[PDB]
């Protein structure tokens, strides 16, 4: 009925420095072109982590830093290379590009802790 984005409150990055989380969205209709962007929020200054465009049922391909798999309205994201400085809030942004209407969805953010 309106756009919603859900993502976990907190995830622990592995010792391998890889963190995974599911980002799922709800839409009034059924989009067929979706663009997913991972943003990093740090004191109102936001940077792009990765982004990918995605036809549903056609697999989600980005790289170098993010991999992703798709399943219905869910996107399983994996972020690799996390060191020490990257602990922070990672926002899932989902743009439903086609068919109209366009929808923008901004998640609440996942606090990724890296050790």
């Amino acid at each position: 009925k309106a756009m919603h984005v859900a993502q976990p409150a907190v995830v622990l990055a592995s010792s391998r420095g890889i963190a995974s989380f599911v980002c799922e969205y709800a839409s009034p209709g059924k989009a067929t072109e979706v663009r997913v962007t991972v943003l990093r929020q740090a004191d109102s200054q936001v940077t792009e982590v990765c982004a990918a465009t995605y036809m549903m049922g056609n697999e989600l391909t980005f790289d170098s830093i993010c991999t992703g798999t798709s399943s219905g309205n869910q996107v399983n994201l994996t972020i690799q290379g996390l060191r020490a400085m990257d602990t922070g809030l990672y926002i899932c942004k989902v743009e439903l590009m086609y068919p109209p209407p366009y929808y923008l969805g901004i998640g609440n953010g996942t606090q990724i802790y890296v050790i």
Partner: antibody
Amino acid sequence: QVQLVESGGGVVQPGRSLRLSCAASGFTFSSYTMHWVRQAPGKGLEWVTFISYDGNNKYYADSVKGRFTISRDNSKNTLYLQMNSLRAEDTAIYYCARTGWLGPFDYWGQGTLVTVSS
Amino acid sequence: EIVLTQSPGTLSLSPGERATLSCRASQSVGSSYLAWYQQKPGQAPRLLIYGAFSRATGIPDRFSGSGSGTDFTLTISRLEPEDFAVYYCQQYGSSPWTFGQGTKVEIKR
């Protein structure tokens, strides 16, 4: 410093065409979606059109659908509005605007006046 | 289309007073998708507030936003001379992007 400089405004007769340009500086142009917004004299703001990062998705307001075309040239850091079949009521200040990564229109050009009249 | 209705049309206030501006939406707008803009005559609009509550960079703290669902408020805690101007709300969560019709904040004398 983020900068959006518009050009191309002026007087055009009804039914004719006119192209506006917006030259962008101070940021990675291809990383942002863009819009045109217009303002008839003494009136409010009306969204005109939206274009995605690489130009593959374009949206239009109903009042201009089938008459206006938005485009962008990412290698020249330039946004365009091609207006066809112009009408008197398209007379307005036209602004380009950048979409912030969190959604709002965070930077605006200073606008150029388009007068449609014979 | 999500219609935004601002009120009042014109606020007449003295400098130094508190200004409260309302924006009502014809259907629910996520708080993450509501912005306020300021416009002075002869100038382009300027982003003030986004995500209903968050100030754009360099916007002074006397400006604050609140609200949710269909009902949003812009507050200016003390009007300075440069704050007398037109204010527009906007939803940017779905197409068509829509604006309120504007509230003019005027000097009362």
